[PDB]
Design a binder for this molecule. Sequence first.
Ligand code: VO4
Length: 282
Amino acid sequence: SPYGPEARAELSSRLTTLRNTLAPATNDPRYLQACGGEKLNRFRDIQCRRQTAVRADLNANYIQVGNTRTIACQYPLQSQLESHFRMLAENRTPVLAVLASSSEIANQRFGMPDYFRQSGTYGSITVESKMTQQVGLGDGIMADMYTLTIREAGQKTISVPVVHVGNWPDQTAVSSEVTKALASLVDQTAETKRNMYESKGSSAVADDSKLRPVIHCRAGVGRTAQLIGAMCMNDSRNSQLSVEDMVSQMRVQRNGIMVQKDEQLDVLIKLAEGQGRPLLNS
Ligand code: VO4
């Protein structure tokens, strides 16, 4: 079987060789380095590929797999918040999907600010949050939805819709069913906001560095990548993209940890198998 153990075995030696090869070296020129003392990375070993970096002071990357464009990033640190909101607005973010649980956010030791469920002022910017709906995606997983209104004097006000999956534990894989259900909710939400921009004649709709969904969990490599992988798979234009290319592209464009657990990989393999999609190149 193309999805047999032998094949999944081949898939692993490949991705594994790639993970070892991309592990950051001290002052690695392939990765963005923090400066002036301020901390850049949340996890010293989960770094940000310099070439595809969105901003110099955020750990966050522009990702494209096949034809799917997104921005995967780390849960911002308290200090990175003003820039993080700038990246949101100028990207004219169609949808912010946050995959970090409320209990991780609630744990004050983890240093994960509640930037999206509460109003605030971050430097020049002013944010306002408004909860809208709650969608059940299956297996007891819920997604709460907000709208963030970002304002900064002299800039045009931007609204961003957020889909927060509040109960997906770090280091785990939600099921293929919950997974595709979430990929859909994210696309639909993005497609509705993009259309609002389109019906308005914004230039951002023409620019391919803008209007990309932003997605992050805590580290931005596991839960964030399981979702990126599924969004790629429901884009019809991504036909014949193997699981090997998909994963290789996420790793070369952010870091080697992309698709952190082997079970998150497994869900990606199940969705593929169900599409008759290929695992291995050649
Ligand atoms: O915060 V996450 O990258 O799933 O492990």
